[PDB]
Amino acid sequence: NHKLIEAVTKSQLRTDLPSFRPGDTLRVHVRIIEGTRERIQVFEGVVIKRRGGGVSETFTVRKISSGVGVERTFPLHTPKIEKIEVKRRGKVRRAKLYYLRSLRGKAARIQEI
RNA sequence: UCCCGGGUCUUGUACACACCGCCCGUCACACCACGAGAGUUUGUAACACCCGAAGCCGGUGGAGUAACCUUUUAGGAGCUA
Known part of the structure; x- marks a missing residue:
């Protein structure tokens, strides 16, 4: 990028995370305080x-x-x-899947690999 | 000729407090049940189409896998996911 924004934001760039692409079903663990x-x-x-x-x-x-x-x-x-x-x-076959915001229950299924 | 009065055989009467009788119909007030009434409201029994949780049966991309066979360190048949 500008190489001065980038040199300041590399301690806040936390990398220990796996790699994925859209079309994958994750499992997040959040930490609420409730x-x-x-x-x-x-x-x-x-x-x-x-x-x-x-x-x-x-x-x-x-x-x-x-x-x-x-x-x-x-x-x-x-x-x-x-x-x-x-x-x-x-x-x-897509990069952003917005068409699953109207498909019901057996049309919102995505095949495996 | 019969009116305020009366006596005889007969007819007709839905009257017998026997004609100063008997009963009929809207209007007025009051109770009571009902039909019609723009709508509104609660129910049952279904049909049409879309969405299909379980569950045996039909098909099993493939990670695993005691029995039986052989090269048995191995694989393999059969199974369940």
């Missing part, structure tokens, strides 16, 4: 959006919770994500 403890709550769904932009890149993972679909967007280098692990790998 409670007597400071518990760790999972989230499981399929990835829609990017992983690029620099030190500001964000992904997007959605699931069908209890009838009503939900989405979550995370900054990739937060201290709030504990770890990321992969369930299954797909083949989607």
Whole structure:
């Protein structure tokens, strides 16, 4: 980039994370503070959006919770994500999958590899 | 000729407080049940199409896998995911 923005933002660029592409179903562990403890709550769904932009890149993972679909967007280098692990790998022919925001239950399936 | 009065055989009467009788119909006030009434509201029994959780059966991309066969260190047949 400008090589002065980039030289300051390399301590805040946290790299210990696996590699993936859209069309994959992750399993996030976030660290909420809601409670007597400071518990760790999972989230499981399929990835829609990017992983690029620099030190500001964000992904997007959605699931069908209890009838009503939900989405979550995370900054990739937060201290709030504990770890990321992969369930299954797909083949989607796209880079951003917005067409799963209207498909019902057996049309929102993505094949494996 | 019969009116305020009366006596005889007969007819007709839905009257017998026996004509100063008997009963008929809207209007007025009051109770009571009902049909019509723009709508609104609660229910049952279905048909049409879309979405298909379980669950035996049909098909099993492939990671694993005691029995039986052989090269048995091996593989393999058969299974479940």
